[PDB]
Design a protein around this ligand. Structure first.
Ligand SMILES: CCCCCCCCCCCCO[C@@H]1O[C@H](CO)[C@@H](O[C@H]2O[C@H](CO)[C@@H](O)[C@H](O)[C@H]2O)[C@H](O)[C@H]1O
Ligand SMILES: CCCCCCCCCCCCO[C@@H]1O[C@H](CO)[C@@H](O[C@H]2O[C@H](CO)[C@@H](O)[C@H](O)[C@H]2O)[C@H](O)[C@H]1O
Lengths: 1033, 156, 48
């Protein structure tokens, strides 16, 4: 193939050009997103039951749905919580690779068939099925700043005038409103009701009668009497449209003929559908839209399109309404694409400098410059072929891949230049010989990295998703690097390189370069002398090598393991949790402190605080809240003092003083979609019918035992909520029957008044909206208020609620959890410092095994994934080792000589580990990506030398030492050039701060430290490897 | 509601004997009360922590503290079947005939859950067997509505 | 049944349409709402 194209340099260009066009096409068609799909597909069933306690939800909704989730394919597990906000969420998680659409429709269809078994009011609210494992592209906040709109006003505005048009925007896949459209709010007054012998039942009835759509028919409808001239639709009653209309609803006509209207027993207004959440943006009322990417869309296009649409809405905004962007993942995509271009450019520069420094002619310099864009473009084409996207991870693989393409180009040109200067051969035939010398080395390096990276792609679940992104960019790049090096670069060498006189090593040249050549030619002699002396005493070097390998093991095992390093993503969270039963108002006071803290004592770093009162991630309620803190750009936050970790630290330390509230800042998970891959995630399960109280007791028992092993287990805690006081009211059936009060009137009166009731729909300015009845706040606050509600007996007498009820305090759950259809309690925790999570899980299983009869357990989430990832690893590494071995064995026609190459691997790894340990980093996936690339690169040096030496023995009959010495003499320069180019190029990764600098620092220091020791050690150690392997065998 | 008081309310509920012991030495308010008016003694009586009941009483806890609906620790202990706790409370002066806001007594509650030994202990300490709740029901009435024949004969 | 075109558009057609965002390969969507209360919403997809 190289000989073919050396005679056909235009054919060569044609292939290069087709590759460039293929890649150019791919870049046009390629999806662009922050992340590939990493999390397993999950589907969430969500339902809402106004006024219902956690148990009511669980036992009339959650259990029924759960019992119907049968005959669905590829389900891994099912989990749910039912809470006293009146909410259920059931989340079904499917095998990775499951079609998410098929999984969702299978779930929706099973649900649809359980709907008639749900409470009427839940069927009325509807039950939503949605893909859950997707994440936000951006969050658009909408605030009002002139104090004219409440958050309900804003939400209704957003829903009426912005939501739909954002959904229609190109590339937008899903939009969620933070809040609701208006609902018609009827706020009842029990005193007024009783005055007119009315109850909430009468209010609901009248509303259903007087706000409704009544079908009628046609005039002159078919079949008609013939001769009929007119056909026309009859319009009868249609839905009410305004508060005045609802106010004028007729409830009763008294004896004196006067009229009782709805507005006479109730306040009437447009309001929110619920009031559980208070959202503020820097202390101002706020709503907003959470927006997701459509499948295969372009995140940058979509973000620009979203902003464009918002602009054309801005002329119609009410006064004080302002758009705000508290969360936008689009920067990260932008930065990553910039990084790739940036690396591409500086690598071209770096290779230029290094080629010119050593080879001292522009023509030689051009050939690697042409190769890199060709190979990189082809990589995009391959990336497209295999269905990948342009994303943060693949783009990151690109920037590494660029560092590796470089070598193939350099190694070819340098060898031709050497052969010319050493034999006086003309460019064409120098090139033919030169390619025969390096061909196999070029293929071998590509094969070794393939044999390493390809098996990593076959890790399952989440780990395999991340690795894959690096596997396909690095390996495609490698295949194309070899392909271009066997087709285009030899054609270019034979046609573009100028002849070199036999023995012209430029030592007689002028000034700097003439100096450099003499300096380098002498250094090479010092170098080869060293190796000869080394080779006269291999024994001590085997000992030295064992010290390294031993050192490597030591360093590897004591390096702490994590999954993903925290990033400064320009935003972070602040948790606010008040004690059980704490009210919405108190939580708001604390959130206001938090907001005040950041807008004061973090004024140089903080852009905004978005305080959400009533929201947690592991339990809602009036006593929990979260503040999302958005930052200024990294550039505007110089130094570690102003990055999320530092800021978080000071915020948490400042908030420790706060009252009766737990308040603390904390970072996002590195990949929010993946959602925290730290520690373990354990499920305690009721396997008989032990019940909630008994399950709490076992949980506590297990939690006690765990806390007695600080040495192994740390921060082991419930993810859910503790029981709280609840007001238990008993209706006396007999006294109700005796007074002639219907149970239905009692229970409707109580539920509608204290819980609120969704009655029907009305139409507000052309949009359909809900109608809710409920007590005004001041008649549903305290137990004394209970006796203010009257129900009408059969005989028309009004009976106080106190006459037929009694009450007492008791504890009960605000949030009931279930796992795979059984009662459960989720427990989080992690390994103590120094311990493996594997070890920590084993102790939990051990402790879990001493629990009372009927209590079981299961591992979920990250733990489930780890349990199955760690079970895969040894067989995957083994396949990699076997294929690396087999390729070299084929490359060298020898069962033994592959060992001389394989022995260099710890020479690279020790540097990686040393740099990691020194800098205090950890063994995470990005470090692991670094080691893998470190293997391939240390193998590169070794393969060059071992190839020269073996060919010199086979073809020219040289002695073992003679060949080895000549081999390392020839290999020195290309090893030095490719290492100097790589080390200099990878440096930005090492010193970068903020904006994905976590992952970069991880891969950079491993890869750089590894390359330093690999080339500094390989040039002395692999001659030893070659000599003692050939000696032993 | 004081800090150590809050800590005491939780420790009592959680049945952490040792923590309670330390808190007693430090003077944590034994008369601390949550929003619904439960004292540490309410909490221990409710969740059945016998030792903590004993310790709280050694340290001046109001044996006859009532919550905002008029319920006492004896109410809670009798209702949830905590026999040894019911005896300790009664020995330490608990009003055997205390009525809550609904006119319900420990006897009503014990009878309703079918706690035979507790009913007997309450009768031993002088519970009024004819006491009527706000609906005019007695513990006997409660027994026979429930179809509890054993209990029904005890109350003759 | 019995609804007019405006009523059925306001309570049915726009309600469904506001949820038809971000379906893969959607070229366009057309609908009609008429006086016998019937609604038809048609979504056309890229040719493949
Ligand atoms: C030139 C480069 C060529 C590179 C080619 C790389 C090929 C990679 C193929 C990997 C195919 C799957 O490889 C792997 O197979 C093994 C054995 O069947 C499975 O491993 C399974 O068997 C092992 C050993 O019996 C068990 O301990 C383990 O619990 C179980 O999961 C893995 O779950 C699967 O990931
Ligand atoms: C591009 C990065 C370059 C970084 C270079 C930094 C220095 C690295 C030094 C590598 C070691 C080479 O050191 C080499 O050691 C061997 C011994 O093992 C010496 O060899 C000499 O001493 C030994 C021991 O008495 C004898 O067995 C041998 O016959 C003799 O000639 C060489 O004189 C020396 O050159």
């Amino acid at each position: 193939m190289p000989n073919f194209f050396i005679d056909r340099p235009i054919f060569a260009w044609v292939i290069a050009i087709i590759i460039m066009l293929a890649g150019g096409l791919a870049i046009l068609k390629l999806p662009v997103a922050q992340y590939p799909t990493i999390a397993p597909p999950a589907v969430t069933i969500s339902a809402s039951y106004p006024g219902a306690d956690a148990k009511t939800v669980q036992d009339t909704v959650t259990q029924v749905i759960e019992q119907n989730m049968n005959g669905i394919d590829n389900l891994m597990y099912m989990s749910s919580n039912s809470d006293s906000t009146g909410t259920v969420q059931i989340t079904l998680t499917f095998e990775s690779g499951t079609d998410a659409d098929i999984a969702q429709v299978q779930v929706q269809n099973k649900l649809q068939l359980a709907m008639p078994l749900l409470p009427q009011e839940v069927q009325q609210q509807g039950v939503s099925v949605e893909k859950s494992s997707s994440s936000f592209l951006m969050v658009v906040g909408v605030i009002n700043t002139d104090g004219t709109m409440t958050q309900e006003d804003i939400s209704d505005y957003v829903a009426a005038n912005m939501k739909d048009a954002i959904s229609r925007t190109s590339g937008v896949g899903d939009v969620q409103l933070f809040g609701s459209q208006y609902a018609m709010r009827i706020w009842m007054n029990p005193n007024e009701l009783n005055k007119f012998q009315l109850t909430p039942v009468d209010v609901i009835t009248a509303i259903k009668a007087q706000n409704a759509q009544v079908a009628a028919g046609q005039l002159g409808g078919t079949p008609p009497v013939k001769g009929q001239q007119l056909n026309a639709s009859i319009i009868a009653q249609t839905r009410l449209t305004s508060t005045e209309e609802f106010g004028k609803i007729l409830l009763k006509v008294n004896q004196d003929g006067s009229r009782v209207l709805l507005r006479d027993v109730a306040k009437i207004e447009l309001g929110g559908e619920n009031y559980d959440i208070i959202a503020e943006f820097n202390g101002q009322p706020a709503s907003g839209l959470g927006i997701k990417l459509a499948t295969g869309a372009n995140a940058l296009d979509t973000a620009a399109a979203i902003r464009a649409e918002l602009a054309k809405m801005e002329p119609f905004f009410p006064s004080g309404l302002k758009i705000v962007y508290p969360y936008d993942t689009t920067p990260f995509v932008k930065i990553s694409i910039h990084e790739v271009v940036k690396t591409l450019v500086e690598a071209i520069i770096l290779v230029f400098l290094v080629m010119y420094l050593f080879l001292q002619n522009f023509r030689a310099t051009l050939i690697p410059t042409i190769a890199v864009p060709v190979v990189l473009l082809g990589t995009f084409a391959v990336l497209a072929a295999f269905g990948f996207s342009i994303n943060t991870l693949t783009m990151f693989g690109m920037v590494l891949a660029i560092g590796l393409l470089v070598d193939d180009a350099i190694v070819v040109v340098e060898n031709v230049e050497r052969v010319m200067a050493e034999e006086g051969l003309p460019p064409k035939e120098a090139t033919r010989k030169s390619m025969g010398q390096i061909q196999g080395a070029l293929v071998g390096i590509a094969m070794v990295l393939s044999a390493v990276f390809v098996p990593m792609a076959f890790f399952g679940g989440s780990t395999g998703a991340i690795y894959r992104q690096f596997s396909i960019t690095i390996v495609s790049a490698m295949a194309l690097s070899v392909l271009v090096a066997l087709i285009l670069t030899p054609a270019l060498c034979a046609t573009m390189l100028k002849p070199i006189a036999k023995g012209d090593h430029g030592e007689g040249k002028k000034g700097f370069f003439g100096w450099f050549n003499r300096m380098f030619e002498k250094s090479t002699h010092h170098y080869t002398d060293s190796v000869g002396g080394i080779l006269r005493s291999t024994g001590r070097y085997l000992v030295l090598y064992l010290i390294i390998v031993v050192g490597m093991a030591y360093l590897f095992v004591r390096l702490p393991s994590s999954f993903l390093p925290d990033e400064d993503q320009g935003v972070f969270m602040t948790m606010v949790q008040l004690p059980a039963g704490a009210t919405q108002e108190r939580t708001q006071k604390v959130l206001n402190e938090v907001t005040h803290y950041y807008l004061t004592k973090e004024k140089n770093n903080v852009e905004s605080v978005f305080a959400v009162n009533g929201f947690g991630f592991a339990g809602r309620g009036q006593n929990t809240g979260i503040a999302f803190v958005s930052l200024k750009d990294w550039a505007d936050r110089p130094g570690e003092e102003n990055k999320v970790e530092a800021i978080t630290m000071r915020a948490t330390r400042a908030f420790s003083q706060i009252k009766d509230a737990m308040v603390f800042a904390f970072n996002l998970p590195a990949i929010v979609e993946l959602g925290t891959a730290t520690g373990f995630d354990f499920e305690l399960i009721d396997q008989a019918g032990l019940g909630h109280e008994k399950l709490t007791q076992a949980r506590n028992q297990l939690l006690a035992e765990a806390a007695k092993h600080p040495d192994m287990l740390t921060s082991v805690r419930p993810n859910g909520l503790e029981d709280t006081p609840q007001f238990k009211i008993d209706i006396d059936q007999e006294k109700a029957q005796a007074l002639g009060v219907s149970i239905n009137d009692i229970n409707t009166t109580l539920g509608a008044a204290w819980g609120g009731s969704y009655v029907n729909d009305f139409i507000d300015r052309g949009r359909v909206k809900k109608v809710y009845v409920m007590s005004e706040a001041k008649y549903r606050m305290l137990p004394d208020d209970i006796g203010d509600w009257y129900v009408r007996a059969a005989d028309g007498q009004m009976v106080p609620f106190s006459a037929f009820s009694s009450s007492r305090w008791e504890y009960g759950s605000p949030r009931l959890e279930r796992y795979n259809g059984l009662p459960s309690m989720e427990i989080l925790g992690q390994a103590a410092p120094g311990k493996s999570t594997g070890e920590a899980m084993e102790l939990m299983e051990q402790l879990a095994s001493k629990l009372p009869t009927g209590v079981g357990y299961d591992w979920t989430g990250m733990s489930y994934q780890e349990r199955l990832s760690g079970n895969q690893a040894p067989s995957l590494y083994a396949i990699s080792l076997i294929v690396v071995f087999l390729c070299l064995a084929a490359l060298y026609e020898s069962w033994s000589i592959p060992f001389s190459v394989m022995l260099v691997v710890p020479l690279g790894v020790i540097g990686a580990l040393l740099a990691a340990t020194f800098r205090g980093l950890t063994n995470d996936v990005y470090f692991q990506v670094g080691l893998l690339t470190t293997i391939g690169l240390s193998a590169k040096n070794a393969i060059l030398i071992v190839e020269f030496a073996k060919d010199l023995m086979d073809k020219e009959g040289k002695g073992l030492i003679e060949a080895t010495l000549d081999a390392v003499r020839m290999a020195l320069r290309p090893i030095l050039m490719t290492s100097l180019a790589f080390i200099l190029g990878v440096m930005p990764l090492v010193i970068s701060t903020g904006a994905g600098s976590g992952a970069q620092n991880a891969v950079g220091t491993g890869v750089m430290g590894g390359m330093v020791t690999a080339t500094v050690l390989a040039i002395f150690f692999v001659p030893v490897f070659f000599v003692v392997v050939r000696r032993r065998f | 509601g004081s800090d150590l008081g809050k800590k005491l309310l939780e420790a009592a509920r959680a049945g952490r004997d040792d923590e309670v012991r330390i808190l007693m030495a430090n003077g944590a308010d034994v008369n601390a009360a949550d929003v619904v008016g439960w004292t540490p003694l309410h909490l221990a009586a409710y969740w059945g922590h016998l030792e903590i009941v004993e310790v709280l009483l050694k340290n001046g806890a109001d044996v006859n503290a009532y919550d905002t609906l008029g319920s006492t620790p004896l109410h809670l202990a009798a209702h949830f079947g905590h026999l040894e706790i019911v005896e300790v409370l009664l020995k330490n002066g608990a009003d055997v005939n205390a009525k809550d806001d609904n006119g319900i007594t420990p006897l009503h509650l014990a009878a309703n859950r079918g706690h035979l030994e507790i009913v007997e202990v309450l009768l031993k300490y002088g519970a009024d067997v004819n006491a009527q709740d706000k609906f005019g029901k007695t513990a006997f009435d409660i027994s026979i509505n429930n179809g509890n024949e054993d209990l029904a004969e005890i109350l003759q």
